[PDB]
Amino acid sequence: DTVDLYDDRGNCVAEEVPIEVLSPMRNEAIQSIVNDIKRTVAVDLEGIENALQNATVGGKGMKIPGREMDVDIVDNAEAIADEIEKMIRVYQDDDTNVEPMYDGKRLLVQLPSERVKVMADPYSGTLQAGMAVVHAIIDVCEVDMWDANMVKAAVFGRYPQTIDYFGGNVASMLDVPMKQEGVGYALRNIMVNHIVAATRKNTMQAVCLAATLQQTAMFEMGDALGPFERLHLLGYAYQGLNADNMVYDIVKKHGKEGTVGTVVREVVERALEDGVIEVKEELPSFKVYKANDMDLWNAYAAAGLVAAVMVNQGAARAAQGVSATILYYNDLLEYETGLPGVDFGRAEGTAVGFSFFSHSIYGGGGPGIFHGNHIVTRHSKGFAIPPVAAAMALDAGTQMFSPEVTSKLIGDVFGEIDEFREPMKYITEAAAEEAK
Amino acid sequence: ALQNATVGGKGMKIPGREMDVDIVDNAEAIADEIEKMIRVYQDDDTNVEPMYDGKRLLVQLPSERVKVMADPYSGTLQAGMAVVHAIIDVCEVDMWDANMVKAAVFGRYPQTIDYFGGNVASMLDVPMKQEGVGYALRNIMVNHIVAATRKNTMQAVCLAATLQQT
Amino acid sequence: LFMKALKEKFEESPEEKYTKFYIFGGWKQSERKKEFKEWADKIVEERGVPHYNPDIGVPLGQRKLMSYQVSGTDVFVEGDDLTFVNNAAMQQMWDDIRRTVIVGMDTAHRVLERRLGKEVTPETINEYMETLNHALPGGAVVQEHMVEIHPGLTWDCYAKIITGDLELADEIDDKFLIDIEKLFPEEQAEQLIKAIGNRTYQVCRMPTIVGHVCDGATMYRWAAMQIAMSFICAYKIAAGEAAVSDFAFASKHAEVINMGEMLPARRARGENEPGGVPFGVLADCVQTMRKYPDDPAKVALEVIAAGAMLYDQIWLGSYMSGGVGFTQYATAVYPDNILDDYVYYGLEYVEDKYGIAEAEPSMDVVKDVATEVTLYGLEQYERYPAAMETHFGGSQRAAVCAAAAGCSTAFATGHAQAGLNGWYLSQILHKEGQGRLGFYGYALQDQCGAANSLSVRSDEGLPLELRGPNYPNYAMNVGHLGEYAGIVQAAHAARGDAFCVHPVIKVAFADENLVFDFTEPRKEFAKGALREFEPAGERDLIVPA
Amino acid sequence: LFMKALKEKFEESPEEKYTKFYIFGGWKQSERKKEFKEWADKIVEERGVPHYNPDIGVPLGQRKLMSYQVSGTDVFVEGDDLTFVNNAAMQQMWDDIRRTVIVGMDTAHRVLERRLGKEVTPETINEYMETLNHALPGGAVVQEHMVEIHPGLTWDCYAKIITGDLELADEIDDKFLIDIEKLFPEEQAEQLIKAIGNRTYQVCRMPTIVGHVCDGATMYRWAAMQIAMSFICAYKIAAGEAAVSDFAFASKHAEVINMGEMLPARRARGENEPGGVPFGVLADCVQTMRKYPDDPAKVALEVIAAGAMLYDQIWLGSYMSGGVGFTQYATAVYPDNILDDYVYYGLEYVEDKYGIAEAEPSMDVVKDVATEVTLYGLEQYERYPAAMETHFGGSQRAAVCAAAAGCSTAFATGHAQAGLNGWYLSQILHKEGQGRLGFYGYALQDQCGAANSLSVRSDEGLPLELRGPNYPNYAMNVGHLGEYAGIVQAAHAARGDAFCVHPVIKVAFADENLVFDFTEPRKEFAKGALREFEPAGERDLIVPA
Amino acid sequence: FYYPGETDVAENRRKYMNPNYELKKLREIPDEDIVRLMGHREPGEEYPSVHPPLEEMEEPECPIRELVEPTEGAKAGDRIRYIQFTDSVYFAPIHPYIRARMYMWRYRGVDTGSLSGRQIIEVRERDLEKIAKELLETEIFDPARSGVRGATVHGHALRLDENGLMLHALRRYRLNEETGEVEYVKDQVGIELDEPIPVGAPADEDDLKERTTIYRIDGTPYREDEELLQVVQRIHELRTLAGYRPEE
Numbered sequence A: 001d002t003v004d005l006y007d008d009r010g011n012c013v014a015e016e017v018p019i020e021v022l023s024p025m026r027n028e029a030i031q032s033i034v035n036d037i038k039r040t041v042a043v044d045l046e047g048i049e050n051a052l053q054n055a056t057v058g059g060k061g062m063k064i065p066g067r068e069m070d071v072d073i074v075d076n077a078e079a080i081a082d083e084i085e086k087m088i089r090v091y092q093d094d095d096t097n098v099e100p101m102y103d104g105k106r107l108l109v110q111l112p113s114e115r116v117k118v119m120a121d122p123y124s125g126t127l128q129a130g131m132a133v134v135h136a137i138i139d140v141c142e143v144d145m146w147d148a149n150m151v152k153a154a155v156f157g158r159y160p161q162t163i164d165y166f167g168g169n170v171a172s173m174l175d176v177p178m179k180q181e182g183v184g185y186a187l188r189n190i191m192v193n194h195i196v197a198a199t200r201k202n203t204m205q206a207v208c209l210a211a212t213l214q215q216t217a218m219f220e221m222g223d224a225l226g227p228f229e230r231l232h233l234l235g236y237a238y239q240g241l242n243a244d245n246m247v248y249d250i251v252k253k254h255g256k257e258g259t260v261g262t263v264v265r266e267v268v269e270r271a272l273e274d275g276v277i278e279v280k281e282e283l284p285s286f287k288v289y290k291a292n293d294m295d296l297w298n299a300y301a302a303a304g305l306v307a308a309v310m311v312n313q314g315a316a317r318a319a320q321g322v323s324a325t326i327l328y329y330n331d332l333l334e335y336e337t338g339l340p341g342v343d344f345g346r347a348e349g350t351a352v353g354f355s356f357f358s359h360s361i362y363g364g365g366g367p368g369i370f371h372g373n374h375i376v377t378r379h380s381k382g383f384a385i386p387p388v389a390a391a392m393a394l395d396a397g398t399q400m401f402s403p404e405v406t407s408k409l410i411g412d413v414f415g416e417i418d419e420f421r422e423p424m425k426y427i428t429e430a431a432a433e434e435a436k
Numbered sequence B: 001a002l003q004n005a006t007v008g009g010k011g012m013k014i015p016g017r018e019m020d021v022d023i024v025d026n027a028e029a030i031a032d033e034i035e036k037m038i039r040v041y042q043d044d045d046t047n048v049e050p051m052y053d054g055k056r057l058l059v060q061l062p063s064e065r066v067k068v069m070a071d072p073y074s075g076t077l078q079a080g081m082a083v084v085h086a087i088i089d090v091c092e093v094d095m096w097d098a099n100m101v102k103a104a105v106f107g108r109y110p111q112t113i114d115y116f117g118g119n120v121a122s123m124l125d126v127p128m129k130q131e132g133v134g135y136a137l138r139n140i141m142v143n144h145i146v147a148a149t150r151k152n153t154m155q156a157v158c159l160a161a162t163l164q165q166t
Numbered sequence C, D: 001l002f003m004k005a006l007k008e009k010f011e012e013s014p015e016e017k018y019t020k021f022y023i024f025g026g027w028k029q030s031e032r033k034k035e036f037k038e039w040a041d042k043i044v045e046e047r048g049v050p051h052y053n054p055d056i057g058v059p060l061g062q063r064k065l066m067s068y069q070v071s072g073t074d075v076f077v078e079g080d081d082l083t084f085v086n087n088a089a090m091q092q093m094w095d096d097i098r099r100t101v102i103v104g105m106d107t108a109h110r111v112l113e114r115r116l117g118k119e120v121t122p123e124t125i126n127e128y129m130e131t132l133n134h135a136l137p138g139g140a141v142v143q144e145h146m147v148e149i150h151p152g153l154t155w156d157c158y159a160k161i162i163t164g165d166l167e168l169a170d171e172i173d174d175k176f177l178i179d180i181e182k183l184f185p186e187e188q189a190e191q192l193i194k195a196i197g198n199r200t201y202q203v204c205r206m207p208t209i210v211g212h213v214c215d216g217a218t219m220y221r222w223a224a225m226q227i228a229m230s231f232i233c234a235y236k237i238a239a240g241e242a243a244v245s246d247f248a249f250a251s252k253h254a255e256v257i258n259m260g261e262m263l264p265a266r267r268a269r270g271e272n273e274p275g276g277v278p279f280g281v282l283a284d285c286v287q288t289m290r291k292y293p294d295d296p297a298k299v300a301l302e303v304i305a306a307g308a309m310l311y312d313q314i315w316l317g318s319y320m321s322g323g324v325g326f327t328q329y330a331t332a333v334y335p336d337n338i339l340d341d342y343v344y345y346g347l348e349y350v351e352d353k354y355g356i357a358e359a360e361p362s363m364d365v366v367k368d369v370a371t372e373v374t375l376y377g378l379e380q381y382e383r384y385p386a387a388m389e390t391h392f393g394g395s396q397r398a399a400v401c402a403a404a405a406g407c408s409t410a411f412a413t414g415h416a417q418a419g420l421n422g423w424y425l426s427q428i429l430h431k432e433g434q435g436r437l438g439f440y441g442y443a444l445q446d447q448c449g450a451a452n453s454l455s456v457r458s459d460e461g462l463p464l465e466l467r468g469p470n471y472p473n474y475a476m477n478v479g480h481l482g483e484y485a486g487i488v489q490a491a492h493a494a495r496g497d498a499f500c501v502h503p504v505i506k507v508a509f510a511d512e513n514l515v516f517d518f519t520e521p522r523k524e525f526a527k528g529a530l531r532e533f534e535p536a537g538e539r540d541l542i543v544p545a
Numbered sequence E: 001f002y003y004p005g006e007t008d009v010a011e012n013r014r015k016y017m018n019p020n021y022e023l024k025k026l027r028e029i030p031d032e033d034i035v036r037l038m039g040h041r042e043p044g045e046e047y048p049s050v051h052p053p054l055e056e057m058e059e060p061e062c063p064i065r066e067l068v069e070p071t072e073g074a075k076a077g078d079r080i081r082y083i084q085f086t087d088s089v090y091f092a093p094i095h096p097y098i099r100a101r102m103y104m105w106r107y108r109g110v111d112t113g114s115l116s117g118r119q120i121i122e123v124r125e126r127d128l129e130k131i132a133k134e135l136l137e138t139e140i141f142d143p144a145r146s147g148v149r150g151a152t153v154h155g156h157a158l159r160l161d162e163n164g165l166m167l168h169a170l171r172r173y174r175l176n177e178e179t180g181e182v183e184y185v186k187d188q189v190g191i192e193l194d195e196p197i198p199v200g201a202p203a204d205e206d207d208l209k210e211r212t213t214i215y216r217i218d219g220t221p222y223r224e225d226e227e228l229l230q231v232v233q234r235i236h237e238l239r240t241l242a243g244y245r246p247e248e
């Protein structure tokens, strides 16, 4: 099985790519993104300064009166960075990278891959990188021994009393292992808004980043395995790596006048023309289509789902009805064909609860705050979250809880890293070389 | 578990859902299917060997699978899901009773947080049982430590110390 | 079956499509809602902050507000008397389950002999139970100057022994024994003894008041503590010695049994909480299989009643949300004998076409039984506009028809998973039939349903017996959970099984010293609806007159 | 201070080392323990399973069984009347904390305008609160045919507004406003307004009965649901529309405040449970800083009383263990004015040597103040064998002396961490003094204590304000937790602070519509001890006469 | 295709879904009275905006944005408002899930929710008023068996008023038998209007059945359409099978 791979502008960038080359354990770029996710941490130096300046530690309205402390963190960001790469480096010639950002308000700390390597907990890099910031502040800013515990709190919040770094000023794409809905859900517990912030509102690149993170958890959970490996390999090529230029071509032609229904019909025609599906039997007026290839049919429908969202929500410039699009793309697509929708029901399944929990009193929220680990959107095996990332990127500003409110730090610091911001070029390039 | 429909563990039995399959006798055939599903390259360190006359089974995943793994316990999902599939289409399990094999392997998961009443084990166990960030390599019983070093005192001390200090 | 109730609730013929509205007096047509304003008035007077107020927002009762015959009974009550907060029996059912922990006695007794050097005999075991029943409610056995708990608050706390070792069973004081042979029909009794084996257990029922102040994960810690105190007392070891830590670990982990297990971070909860309780286990708590072995429908219907109540009204409608809640989401499946009619007829169908529990599990049987009963149930709602007006939400309509369909498919096969697969066929039929299904996120489950039903993957595959409110699809939405328990019970009732998934939990809830009567949940609900049920845990002794 | 009580409890002079035993009639010397057998007898008669029985194991009362003057009062009661299960006030204190959730109103109101296009003004905000106080207790605002909850069961549920925006504050109905300027002394008021800022909050207090049937993590889900229902009603948007999901997310996560956060897997629990509540927060619940601003000792002593009670008796003694429990582990620090004497004298010492809150935090001050007060307290127990016989366990002896030492060191510095460091010096002094410290695992904390106190590492460093029963060292053992809260209060009382760690939680628990009186916890306990306290949540309306 | 089915109701279901099939007009309601029914704004006043127009915004470097044309309200930055319908089980021409399928075929930029007793569409404000007109004056609406309501939606599964109308707890519409027309006296949330808006002329039982989309025993029984019942059973089979094993 060989898919062609195209970029975010519809141009071809790799020829006959065997889909076996696209699995995380075969693909080098994906391998490295996982490494870069365990090692890359964002630290808010301005936020730690404010917290310490006003004794507002632990977060959420708290203030420890009489324990205020005027230290200058931002101004010494450079000096703090230097101490950090001292504590953190393993070899002189490794990939430790600790650079101040935004005039010293922010700080990217990337641990040496040597530290990753021997790390069980994927979030752990935050402890290591954060504890450096803690120590570096104490003996650059000359903090008193009796008030040092205030620096620990400005950095890590209420930890260990809370399960997480509550009210802290440390962040990564991952967050704490005990917040996981199940084994291997680590790479699933990354907000769509985080995804969209780090790809800087580039729709194709958001879809990609969501898809590769999703499908890498699909492999980790033993879902993409055995008689299912192919389902996710092809599902992944078409959804996230713009295989056959199918997502891009559908949107090029349906983008000016099209709806979710016309995109549905676009999917049925193309599978028809390619011998993916045929006519099983002809009822009294209407055709029941069969699948010649169940995995590639799913892959085809899945690609059209992303296109369905891009055309529909892109027309409104509002995220919102991504939940309706996913619901009704699969609803229509089934009763147009007599075949299962994407993910054999689960994709439409997710969108029913998603629609509910984005339009009611009981919970949820707006589209950007969901992720592969939200109980409302955990059900579909990688085929729903990448749509949701397209929608939240196509938003011109209708959301209260946008990437700028929830995912600011991530967007500012991770946005600066290239394989985070633009993972397509890297995965497809990796896939080319890997195929020799 | 499958012979007596005692799945989920802790005294449970689903009556009328008993199922006589022979797992142990086909341990060799099951292993072979497992290294098929699990291998990444022909020349990697996949190792899937039957132990104790087919009663037990060591499944070591290719380091290629580790490499891209966030959850440290996850190898159990991968290795276990292989055992699940390998039993179904070597022992010719009926589609409607296949969910019983999932339960014999992984217990009450996902209803329970862990593989409660399951028959899968590693030195690590599930991330949400951790007392804090990075406590993964800490959540290994002293008895596990001592069992694996076969009651050798110096080597137990060692294994405990290096896991602790790591 | 639903005609008598339909003619009591409605002036018109059940057949008529027309009636009058806006002519009932609004809010104040109802006895209950009047009572509520009276109390609100007295509250605000004494208090100074406004409370309940009819005139805020919506004027209830522009239609006639219904009474409901609790199915299987001849008691008609207002809907307001079936909210769990307004109903003591409903609260006491949950209380009895939450406060139940069962602990293995075998390795404990092994410790006493192999490590502490003390003989374990029936004579000492009885002595031990006299002690445990002093110690469990808060009595002192070892330390001088101990304060104690008022027995008047804890009159519902006690312990008994379950044992499949029949030779030990009739050496234990009858008052300390949950007798399997006395409590059960002959064949259910033998099926249970075989399933339990010569293993012996300690059933502890904590005080309800302790669940009121604390939570479910208190329950086993409390059981473990007093069990260890009683061992110390009865076998005269050191009151604090190495081997005592074996008692702590046997009781709390190695040989323990709780009605529920803990839940993940977003719905963070310890043990013995409603979401950790599996369908098969809730089904084995209900004791209707004991009294009506030859009516698979009553046993299942009765399991639905206390499933929907527990899982929708108390669990989803309070723990997971709160407010006014989900009374009638649950009631749609235990008032008015509507579901009862659908289920019984479905059984008459299976009884004819196939045998009871005689059908090979196959897509063919599901496709047949599921479709037949769903069309039947759909057709009853459009034949009787009265029943349509009773079950006004589609969610509860979908639930009533899918339950009937699901349990019916279980009646034929005797296999929960097949039955479940029929539920998911029924729903997707209802969809295209009325051009609707339920509320907004109603069909998340049911659209994932077909693929996950027989799947074997990670967080996808699992027999229905073993599933619960923590199974990913099932964790959010009403009109599903208790009905699934009904399908588990239906499968196992059709076969004549004594239990669905747990022998010991089954025997434990057969005990006549429980407060709720688990043989007849529906009749109990009406007892609570009429304010005739006497709950435990009330603090009227330690409070002014 | 402890003499009057020591002479009431003991016939002899407090000085005497000798007395008579074995001459009190055993068990039956005590009014309470007699009552308990009476009720046990009636229970077993009706029941058929033995219950409470004096004659099992140990014969209580071979020594005289003590009465206890609740410190600060003139009420003497048996120990049995201060078990939380026997005491309604103690249960109601926990109830009021567990059922409290505070929600930010700012982004919610922003949504209405920026997304839903509706104006938010004081007129609409008051209308909204009339609605919320109909909706919170279970009243219907939008859907027809809604069943409702009995106001008679929920007469303690309500909501009020906290706001540092003083211009909005006196535009809100006084009955909907927790007025910071009315409730607080002038300077505490201004310190609070400054700390809160122009941010406005929604204090919701759920029904106690709901905490009885459910748990703490119910509390906010319930708050969030009815808040969203009331917004829908009052601002006339679609009852189910996109921006409503902003309300769900603001109320449940982004702008929410709970008294406790969730706990890890081994002590798995959701929110608003006792172990998730930090020392500084429990301290800011108690309102004694309001009434006695110029007595740092009373404010701290009062925080110890409701800390030890909550954390030892209810939390550690039930949730985490159970049984007879840990009454007197807690009582050692609120009966008999024993700790009171030690604390006051320690303050007189600090008041002299240093100033109140005037000492630089240093090892020198700890070394001085800690050692002086620990030797004092140790020397009082060996001077008065009567007080030694009162506080018969070493754990409670260590706790009384370490609390006095710890709070005293806090009185000098005004810094919780310094104060805490003095606790850990005091303990290691007690050790070598009497050749003992407490029960077996008493000093796990106190031996880790010195190194973790000022440490800054992962699960080691954290100011005491921010610590709680989930701080690794602190999660297991009695005679520590509530005393730590006292040290947090001591530090902040010495400074004259209005709060220790949370402005909003402080104002919230100042409200006079709470059931428990949080200004005076000790006096309330005696009110519950004498069975004079009227709790909420009782179900006598829905139950036969 | 749209939708399988060999019966009349199935055909009305390809018709309303088909953007080629012209929806037969039964009424004529002026734009001012659509703005008043959806009481979001006053018809004279301009459009409120949730964000500034795209023609003057920092539009992100995105090659997908360039392919997809925004709608009128998107370019102006209009706020997203709604309209909600409740359709009676007694032969209402259009029904919730069928409404949403029509929307996803007919209109651009659609957010919609199909519930049992309510159906809501949410899009840009100016485009919503244009969509609402077609929904209100064509054969898809009927002022007796279909009601406009954004709150207290109770009534779809309820028996009919003496006048043949669906229950309205808030009494939004009234029957003016002087003209024989149904007219709204309140907006869709229940606030009293200044003057009644005649959307009237309720159809008789015969015309409704000829254009109904609900399967009913007293109309076209669900049991009758075997070709629909075969496709829905096919989706069930292939779902259960593929979820077990994709295939081969």
Ligand code: F43
Binding pocket: A359, A360, A361, A362, C322, C323, C324, C325, C326, C327, C328, C329, C330, C392, C393, C394, C395, C396, C438, C439, C440, D139, D140, D141, D142, D143, D144, D146, D147, D225, D226, D229, D232, D239, D240, E115, E116, E117, E118, E150, E151, E152, E153, E154, E155, E156, E157
């Ligand atoms: C405001 C919402 C949005 C939301 O997230 N939840 C609501 C309201 C909420 C409130 C209504 C209480 C009140 O009136 O103040 C409560 C009781 C939850 C709570 N906070 O306690 C509830 N829904 Ni609702 N809700 C219900 C139902 C329904 C059905 C009613 C259809 C009809 O024709 O009447 C529809 C959904 C559907 O169409 O399927 C519905 C919608 C809605 N549901 C629409 C309001 C619809 C309206 O404007 O009238 N509920 C039901 O169908 C049965 C169960 C019933 C619940 C009460 C109970 O179980 O006793 C209640 C359960």
Ligand SMILES: C[C@@H](OP(=O)(O)O)[C@H](NC(=O)CCCCCCS)C(=O)O
Binding pocket: A357, A362, A363, A364, A365, A375, A376, C266, C267, C316, C317, C320, C321, C475, C476, C477, C478, D221, D248, D249, D252
């Ligand atoms: C989704 C989730 O909510 P959040 O998105 O986390 O705010 C979850 N609520 C629920 O599942 C509520 C379910 C009961 C009410 C809806 C019944 S259909 C919870 O509170 O943990």
Ligand SMILES: O=S(=O)(O)CCS
Binding pocket: A356, A359, A360, A361, C438, C439, C440, C441, D240, E115
């Ligand atoms: O109207 S909703 O489906 O969102 C809630 C039903 S209670």
Ligand SMILES: O=S(=O)(O)CCS
Binding pocket: C240, D438, D439, D440, D441
């Ligand atoms: O004796 S122990 O220290 O183990 C327990 C004291 S309650």
